[PDB]
Symmetry: C3
């Protein structure tokens, strides 16, 4: 569930969805309508992590932060399956593609897209409305704004209404 | 070992399948006979169905999900390597998705084909039967011998169902 | 912690094993080591060794194939969501987050595998060197990473004061 490390307690909005098997630990803030999915890990100890309103952190993703590099997810952000966002700033409407890695100090602009499996080097800026892909990542072109966040606001509310464990 | 019902979608898991501790099979999922879903793996079907074929192993930390119009359909004797992501794609009989790889919506992995470890298979890419695809992004490179992971995991799963116990 | 047949993990009392981590089978976990949330350390057909003071971070995966033991040396860091498979990682080294290290590969002393890099089977990363790319390429000498001392201290803090809310 939700874990207090020493005296650091996650602050989770009651409309947020924390899936079974997800771990929210320590200095973490999870906003209204946010969702953290199965097997995801959100840990804030040496530095804080913010999951803005309506931001979804999909299955197997990992959020963490280093001193001086807080992990700040803006509102209506999507962190795809198995992505790692570490000490970076992701602004409103952006998408971190599934399997991608965003490193410390990187900055994902509004409605920007980090391609699947791309590795964003430390400090790199992804401008607003642009697609960055590759290993290492590189700004390629303008890209249409992702629509994953409204999908996951609604999918999360359905999960909050009808999720039941069943034994076999 | 438990499984998760989303709305009216309960996973249909064959009795000979092995579902490991820490694995999360959610919603519209079929898990075939002799299949195995290993520790920390997530197989989630809600927006669209997901099928784990018979004798198919979904290894540790792997993530399966499907998008509208893109079912995630794993054929028989398929291997999804450690920490891979197969999203809304078709994987034909005997193929291998290398560990850490990502396979995106609409991709098709031909029979006995191999996705290289860490490779990212773009949406809609077709990997022909018996071929090898690797790189970021993935490219079909050469013909490769059929992998033999699925038989070994059928047997390893059977050993786990008989002698896996929690300790202190 | 899970036993597989006759294979029981041997975990030192000072090691931190976070909730949601899965240590399975023929696994050694040394003094002052830590296995964090969602990580999977599985040893069945071959042995895995997590050396003293070595941290296996969140969602990382360790496994081994016959003849390829996964041997993590002391003071080693396996970053978030990394995969180290049947490889040898020497003292002080760093496997960057999201990276993949495959069978028979050797990560030299204080070497660094960059984040998301894929070290092919059998490849050697020499001591004090950085490897990047997919596949991996030895790029330049790098200063010793300092993650292992920080995580030794963080793990002892987590062993003492971690409670579900
Ligand atoms: Zn970290
Ligand atoms: Zn998805
Ligand atoms: Zn393996």
């Amino acid at each position: 569930s939700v874990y207090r490390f020493e005296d650091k307690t996650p602050a989770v909005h009651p409309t947020a969805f924390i899936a079974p098997g997800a771990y929210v630990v320590g200095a973490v803030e999870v906003g209204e309508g946010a969702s953290i999915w199965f097997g995801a890990v959100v840990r804030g100890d040496l530095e804080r992590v913010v999951v803005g309103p309506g931001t979804n952190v999909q299955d197997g993703a990992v959020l963490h932060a280093d001193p001086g590099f807080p992990c700040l997810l803006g509102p209506e952000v999507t962190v795809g399956h198995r992505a790692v966002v570490h000490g970076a700033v992701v602004e409103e409407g952006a998408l971190v593609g599934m399997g991608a890695v965003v490193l410390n100090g990187a900055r994902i602009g509004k409605n920007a897209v980090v391609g699947a499996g791309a590795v964003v080097p430390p400090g790199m800026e992804v401008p607003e409305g642009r697609l960055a892909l590759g290993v290492p990542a590189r700004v390629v072109r303008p890209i249409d704004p992702p629509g994953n966040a409204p999908r996951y606001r609604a999918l999360a509310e359905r999960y909050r209404k009808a999720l039941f464990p069943v034994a076999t």
